[PDB]
Ligand binder design. Structure first.
Ligand SMILES: OC[C@H]1O[C@H](O)[C@H](O)[C@@H](O)[C@H]1O
Length: 305
């Protein structure tokens, strides 16, 4: 019967593959089929929408590849009598202000970013690094609000625990992926020869991993590096390696909730004109490291590791 879209900007990340698996579980429970389309750039996004109107879909969940496409995605969907829910990244108007009217499902970004900052400082104390030869590398993507609130929340926590403000160095990355973050961290590294230990701050696992691979290339051994990712499911290949590395752990939020919950809310609204709440913030988070990753994921239902 009913066909609903689930469009994601980055199908390569296990984060979005998980949302897709859980949207499928909601289609089997509620009686709808989920059409799964990758939308890595804005042209594919707008095309994908035409494509869903041709398959007869009545609505879609989307994680847009650029928040500034919001108006266009809304104009096209209104065009085809399709309801829209945004997952993870909020639509913004042309001036950059949030479009408050499309229902949104996202993580509590500031709170998880603060947890990241508090865990970096606890591991730094466990290792006993001297703060005078340590520094924070913060890889930022400030044009995306969800990314910006996670890195600022993390820098803010670090400064609140007492890490010196002037030894916090920010560098923007051009893409939210390993090659982008690598290039960014590499450029920051050669500018600071005085630093003997680094904390790496990034909004997600791929961003922290690019950071860590750059440090390795510049001769830091793992004891001198601490990076902690966000997404959990994306760091399982790192945490499964024989050897420990500078990537110490990752904060596991709930992509299963993002996937099923937005897909069930879209269906209630398409099928019973039941209006979704405008804003749903998911606060779940657990620290996974090489010691508990397998247990914690099996415990959240994401079995295998
Ligand atoms: O909501 C969490 C989600 O936030 C953004 O969309 C990131 O690019 C993803 O990798 C994921 O971390």
């Amino acid at each position: 019967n009913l066909k609903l879209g689930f469009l994601v900007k980055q199908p390569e990340e296990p984060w979005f593959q998980t949302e897709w698996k859980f949207a499928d579980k909601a289609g089997k429970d509620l009686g709808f089929e989920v059409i799964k389309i990758a939308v890595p750039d804005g042209e594919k996004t707008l095309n994908a929408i035409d494509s869903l109107a041709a398959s007869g879909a009545k609505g879609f969940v989307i994680c847009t590849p650029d928040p500034k496409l919001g108006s266009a995605i809304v104009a096209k969907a209104r065009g085809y009598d399709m309801k829209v829910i945004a997952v993870d990244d909020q639509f913004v108007n042309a001036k950059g202000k949030p479009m408050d009217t499309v229902p949104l499902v996202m993580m509590a970004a500031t709170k998880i970013g603060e947890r990241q900052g508090q865990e970096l400082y606890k591991e730094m104390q466990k290792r006993g690094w001297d703060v005078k030869e340590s520094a924070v590398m913060a890889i930022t993507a400030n044009e995306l609000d969800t990314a910006r609130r996670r890195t600022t929340g993390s820098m803010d926590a670090l400064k609140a625990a007492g890490f010196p403000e002037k030894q916090i160095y920010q560098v923007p990355t051009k893409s939210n992926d390993i090659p982008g973050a690598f290039d960014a961290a590499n450029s920051m590294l050669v500018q600071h020869p005085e630093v003997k230990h680094w904390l790496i701050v990034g909004m997600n696992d791929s961003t922290v991993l690019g950071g860590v691979r750059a440090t390795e290339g510049q001769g830091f051994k793992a004891a001198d590096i601490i990076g902690i990712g966000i997404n959990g499911v994306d760091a399982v290949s790192e945490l499964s390696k024989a050897q420990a590395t500078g990537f110490y752990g990752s904060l596991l939020p709930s992509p299963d909730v993002h996937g099923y919950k937005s897909s069930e809310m879209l269906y209630n609204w398409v099928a019973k004109d039941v209006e979704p709440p405008k804003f749903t913030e998911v606060t779940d988070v657990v620290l996974i490291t090489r010691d508990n990753f397998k247990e914690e994921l099996e415990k959240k239902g994401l079995g295998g590791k």
